[PDB]
Every structure is written in structure tokens, then in C-alpha cells.
Design a protein around this ligand. Structure first.
Ligand SMILES: CC(C)(C)c1nc(-c2cccc(NS(=O)(=O)c3ccsc3)c2F)c(-c2ccnc(N)n2)s1
Length: 267
């Protein structure tokens, strides 16, 4: 069984998640849409078509082009708007958690800058349909273009399929978010020991939750698999930060919030 402090910790994380995760994406609006050397390699990894289902029942569908000049950039303003919406939710999530509110403001900033991408991807995994290869974001859908084995070569995509296969509960997703947010080794963190102890507590709570609620042979080593996925997600984070910085170098597109989170100064 979980201790009372562990149950309290899960309840606080679950409360934060329900208050700040717009799972129907109902408040995502006014976003941009595509017009009616190494950077080229970066942009060709994630090929998705886009579908918008109107409230009236109409459907708009967008297929992207092939790498033939600037057409490589057509989906960037939209994805920047979606990422920014997601990041705002992640910041709200962190800010309503007491363990986070109690850290120095500078460490709050450093932890969010370290983890925003990772928590965004963890939330996106919960709307991933692995059978159809689509992220279902309310009236918006992102569908992977046509194989499956070739798609698992891209580390982000393999991440989403492998995490979805673990069939996690909401509670395990929110503890993954907590363990990623409270990483004591993000650059600029001052309360290294406080953050390390918090992270350890969240990981212990996760290990115990799995021990108490998941007896099936399929869930053996589940805790260790989850921690391996978090390590992989940190590596994916570093790689995509580099991709973003290269693209932004050649073709500015980051929103103000993305600039803040990725360290771009405006000069
Ligand atoms: C929502 C899904 C999971 C479908 C996506 N997720 C990213 C994604 C990938 C990497 C990073 C981010 N976030 S980020 O760094 O602020 C950013 C925003 C625009 S470039 C970088 C993402 F949202 C996508 C993306 C980004 C750019 N092009 C294309 N074709 N797909 S599709």
C-alpha cells in the first residue's frame, strides 16, 4: 500500500493535471495554418497531415509537400503555435504544485526551461492513437504520413509508440511528468539537493504505486522501463533543442514563449 504522504502527492499531481490539461484542446484557437543542408534533414523527420473538424461537421485536411526551397517551413508557424499552447499548460501545471511553488523563483524558471519539451511530449502521448498513428487533439488531428518500421527510426516517434505500449494510467503519466520536472541536474539549478530529494520521492511513489496496483506478469519491471523512457526522453529533448536552434538560426519562427524557454534573447 501507499503511505498517506504518497497518496497526498499523487492527489496533488492529479489535481494539477486536471486543472491545467485541456484534453479537448477547446481553448487552442487563432493558430496559424500552412498557406493555402542539415536543416533539410531535421525538417523531414516528422511528416504529418493535419485535419480540422469544424463544429458544424465540416472537415479541412492538409497534406504537406515534399522537399523540393522554403516549402520545408510551411508547418512551422502552426507547430510553434501548438507548442506554445502546450507549454502554457505545462507552466500552469508546475505552478499549481506545492513542491514546485516552494522552490526559489530562479529554480522554477530553470526547471521549466529544462523540462517543458519533455512534459509536452508526455501529455501528447496520452492523446496518441498508436493504432492509427494519430495525435487526437480535440477537433485537430495530426496523422503520420505513410513503413511502420521505418517510422520507428525517428527517436521521437519510437518514443511515442514504445510509451503508448506500456499502457500507463493517468497517475503514472503525472508522476513521469513530476520526475522530469524535478530534475536536479538541469542547467542553472541552485537547490540541487532539494530538487534531488523531491525527485527521489516522486520516483519512490511511482515504484510503490506500480507495486500496489500492477501485479500482472506484463508489468514486471514496469518502473524500470518508465525510468528508461524518461532517460530516452531527455536525450530526445537535447537533440530537438539542437534542431530547433539550427532552424531558428536559418529561419526565425520561435514564439516569444519558445524564445524564453529555449534561451533566445532577441538580439
Ligand atoms: C504534436 C506532434 C507530436 C504531432 C508534434 N510534435 C512536434 C514537435 C517536434 C519537436 C518540437 C516540438 N516543439 S518545439 O520545439 O517548440 C517546436 C515547435 C515547432 S518546431 C519545434 C514539437 F511540437 C511536431 C513538429 C514540429 C515541427 N515540424 C513538424 N512537422 N512537426 S508534430
Amino acid at each position: 500500500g501507499l503511505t498517506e504522504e504518497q497518496r497526498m502527492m499523487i492527489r496533488e499531481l492529479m489535481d494539477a493535471q486536471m486543472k491545467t490539461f485541456d484534453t479537448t484542446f477547446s481553448h487552442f484557437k487563432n493558430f496559424r495554418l500552412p498557406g493555402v543542408s542539415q536543416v533539410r534533414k531535421d525538417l523531414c523527420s516528422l511528416k504529418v497531415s493535419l485535419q480540422l473538424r469544424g463544429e458544424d461537421g465540416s472537415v479541412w485536411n492538409y497534406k504537406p509537400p515534399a522537399d523540393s526551397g522554403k516549402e520545408i517551413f510551411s508547418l512551422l508557424p502552426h507547430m510553434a503555435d501548438m507548442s506554445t499552447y502546450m507549454f502554457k499548460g505545462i507552466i500552469s501545471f508546475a505552478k499549481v504544485i506545492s513542491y514546485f511553488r516552494d522552490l526559489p523563483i530562479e529554480d522554477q524558471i530553470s526547471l521549466l526551461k529544462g523540462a517543458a519539451f519533455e512534459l509536452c511530449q508526455l501529455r501528447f502521448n496520452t492523446v496518441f492513437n498508436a493504432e492509427t498513428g494519430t495525435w487526437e487533439c480535440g477537433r485537430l488531428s495530426y496523422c503520420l504520413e505513410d513503413g511502420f518500421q521505418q517510422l520507428l527510426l525517428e527517436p521521437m516517434l519510437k518514443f511515442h509508440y514504445m510509451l503508448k505500449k506500456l499502457q500507463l494510467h493517468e497517475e503514472e503519466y503525472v508522476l513521469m511528468q513530476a520526475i522530469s520536472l524535478f530534475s536536479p541536474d538541469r542547467p542553472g539549478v541552485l537547490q540541487h539537493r532539494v530538487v534531488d530529494q523531491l525527485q527521489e520521492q516522486f520516483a519512490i511513489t511511482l515504484k510503490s504505486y506500480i507495486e500496489c496496483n500492477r501485479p500482472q506478469p506484463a508489468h514486471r519491471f514496469l518502473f524500470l522501463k518508465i525510468m528508461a523512457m524518461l532517460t530516452e526522453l531527455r536525450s530526445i529533448n537535447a537533440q530537438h533543442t539542437q534542431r530547433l536552434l539550427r532552424i531558428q538560426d536559418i529561419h526565425p519562427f520561435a514564439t516569444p514563449l519558445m524564445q524564453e524557454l529555449f534561451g533566445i534573447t532577441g538580439s
